[PDB]
């Protein structure tokens, strides 16, 4: 235990979920690599340390403890070597930029319009539930082959998997403090199995253009498919973050723009600025805030800390994206910040595989929103609360417009 960091013993899991930025501002200054007792792990808080660990030859991926309890093996985020190479080859075809550009407009734009048509003349909406989450899940769900799974159900599953995979608190002995918090993750997985097993049965015999059919068949000898137990953990990884994060990025970008009314006006007037607005939104409130980790494979010294082999380090990219070595007043959303590197998609061989797709989902969603409701305003009678340490985003976004 590091003596000058004794204050970390009193940091709680609830504090980090409600708002992790004050604790992490101290970590960035005091200890860029620091052991946080309630998380049971070293955490990397600065841009230099996160990028170093994520790209180091002396580290490889490891799943967080609660992530492992939630996803099992081989989750694409938690494995390395030949298995990781295979799972990357499995997921990459539909995410290739030239491929996304073929069909992303015809996928997302009619989905955004469908959800907008439900409320665009109301004069009020809660955009997280009514727009950002539905467009995110319906887009990806259709790409995957889950057309028949309602957006309400996809939203419920990612919320249960989020809480399970971020159920990280440990007690004085390093044991999970809230073991009952994994039960709703187990229940989501059981429901997913009941829906998806018959789809896999069908795709094995009758392949189609759905992404999960391609995960079963691509790259395989004739008449063979990847075993469903081998792909289900990556299906679960998708049904948490890939379903959740484009909605979170959309919504955080909107909260940021509302916080800078002159910048919201600029972006509504000039939608070619939407990609810049989104990149700043991701830096400003990173959707994947501290959900992944790496483990040393040899003894290594990082940020002055001598780590043995086998040491996990959580990558708190959402903190690294407020590093004041890189950014001026990072807690302020600013469209006009210079377009600098950021870590909201991670780094290294385990960096996000879906960046290009995700950026287009968020872009098309915001384009359609501002076209439909150009006089959109935040409802300032309602607070926006952000929640989450592992995955972070606004829990609601009440808006109003003159009808
Ligand atoms: C704005 C939305 C998104 C954000 C901010 C985001 C961010 C991230 C981050 C931070 C990681 C971990 C990287 C690391 O540990 O260094 C990651 C991993 C990953 N993401 Fe994205 N993600 C988003 C959307 C998506 C979508 C929509 C997909 C799929 C269609 C996707 C697929 C993946 C995959 C497959 C991985 C695992 C990569 C690996 O471990 O090799 N992401 N993402
Ligand atoms: C793409 O989904 C994830 C990325 C990182 C950690 C958990 C996820 O579900």
Numbering used by the authors: 5 to 407
What does the paper say about this structure?
Thus, we prepared the GcoA-F169A variant and measured its guaiacol and syringol binding properties. Both ligands were able to stimulate the Fe(III) spin state conversion at levels close to wild-type (WT), with KD values in the low micromolar range. Each protein variant also crystallized successfully with guaiacol and the structures showed that the orientation of the bound ligand remained consistent with that of the WT enzyme. Even the largest reduction in side chain bulk, represented by the GcoA-F169A variant, retained the ideal reactive geometry for the natural substrate. Furthermore, comparison of the surrounding active site architecture confirmed no significant deviation from the WT. When NADH and O2 were present in excess of guaiacol, the measured stoichiometry of the GcoA-F169A–catalyzed reaction was very close to 1 molecule each of guaiacol and NADH consumed to 1 formaldehyde and 1 catechol produced, without overconsumption of NADH (103 ± 7% coupling efficiency). Moreover, GcoA-F169A has a slightly improved performance with guaiacol as a substrate relative to the WT enzyme. Thus, the GcoA-F169A mutant, which showed enhanced turnover on guaiacol and syringol, is closer to the CYP255A consensus protein than the WT. Unexpectedly, we found that GcoA-F169A not only binds both guaiacol and syringol in a productive orientation analogous to guaiacol in WT GcoA, but also is more catalytically efficient for O-demethylation of both guaiacol and syringol relative to WT, where O-demethylation is well coupled to NADH oxidation.
